[PDB]
Design a protein around this ligand. Structure first.
Ligand code: NI
Length: 341
């Protein structure tokens, strides 16, 4: 049964609620982004109206085969009317196609659902600036002060510099990047751009990237692995056994692998700076864990909320334990007392 924190009161709407069968009273189903924990349940047999971004709509049609007549894509930053309720989709700074959703209830209440997001000061100048928000449904993934990580830009600087140095020392090294979902495309695209290579990948993954409206993509990716020196593999194969095996398959073209695992947070963050990150090495294989996040750090989250000043916060992540819930509620109170709302 659908939990309360996926329901929008005073509407017929749910958010990211496709795994519960027919939700009683739901007249439209919103989907914030194409990640499996959120889309779980959608297929070609779905016959209710789904409302989402253009990019999420492309993925629904091509990857899950949802029928076109049930896909309702909306433009960003534009006031739209859905079943008699004004809504606006905003960029969530998460994966491609990811949105937050502003709902303007018929009684005057205004709700923001963040979906999954990485808060940024740029959001303080969207259509959020223009009215008060009463209730916030918040991505609380890293809602604890131990979660610090660098900017995306510092992480890509590290990755480009490391790859360029390694391949310039050894023109026979191959770079491998792990993936298991959309998101974090800048990692492998930035490395390929510095090396003057296209990214090589499976046909399934190529199909997925072709749905993303990324400019000049035919220029950056390919299914011809033999022509590429940056290869994308499943995240599960990013280990010494999986990489040894892949290196065999390249037929003696390469004699070394440098690999990247973009994680979110890992406790090496508490102590070590990005500049100081070192790989795990075995023989001619090195594996770098890099803290590339698509969710808010604790500080980014706190800045957003203290700027928005919502009357009520509803967490959407870490809600399954009493200790987690109590911890987040204590931070929300601190923030409110410090800022004065
Ligand atoms: Ni997500």
């Amino acid at each position: 049964t659908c939990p309360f924190y996926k329901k929008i009161p005073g509407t017929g709407f749910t958010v990211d609620a496709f795994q519960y069968g027919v939700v009683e009273g739901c007249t439209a189903y919103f989907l914030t982004h194409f990640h499996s924990d959120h889309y779980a349940g959608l297929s070609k047999h779905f016959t209710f109206p789904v409302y989402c971004s253009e990019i999420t709509g492309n993925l629904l049609k091509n990857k899950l085969h949802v029928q076109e007549q049930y896909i309702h894509p909306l433009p960003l930053d534009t006031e739209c009317i859905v079943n008699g309720v004004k809504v606006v989709l905003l960029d969530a700074n998460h994966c491609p196609g990811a949105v937050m959703i502003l709902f303007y209830l018929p009684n005057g209440t205004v709700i923001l659902h963040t979906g999954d997001f990485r808060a940024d000061p740029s959001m303080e100048r969207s259509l959020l600036a223009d009215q008060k928000v009463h209730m916030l449904y918040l991505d609380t993934t890293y809602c604890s002060p131990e979660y610090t990580f660098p900017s995306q830009q510092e992480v890509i600087r590290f990755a480009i510099n490391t790859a360029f140095e390694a391949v310039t020392l050894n023109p026979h090294a191959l770079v491998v990047c792990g993936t298991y979902s959309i998101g974090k495309e800048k990692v492998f695209l930035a490395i390929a751009d510095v090396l003057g290579s296209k990214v090589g990948m499976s046909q399934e993954k190529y199909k997925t990237l072709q749905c993303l409206n990324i400019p000049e993509i035919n220029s950056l990716i390919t299914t011809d692995m033999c022509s590429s020196l940056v290869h994308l593999l499943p995240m599960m194969q990013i280990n010494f056994k999986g990489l040894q095996s892949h290196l065999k398959k390249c037929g003696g073209k390469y004699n070394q692998i440098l690999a990247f695992r973009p994680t979110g947070w890992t406790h090496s963050n508490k102590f070590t700076r990005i500049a100081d990150v070192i790989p795990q090495t075995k023989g001619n294989i090195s594996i770098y864990g890099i803290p590339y996040s698509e969710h808010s750090s604790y500080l980014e989250m706190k800045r957003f909320v203290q700027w928005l000043k919502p009357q009520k916060i509803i967490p959407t992540v870490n809600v399954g334990t009493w200790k987690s819930r109590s911890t987040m509620e204590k931070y929300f109170r601190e923030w409110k007392l410090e800022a004065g709302y």
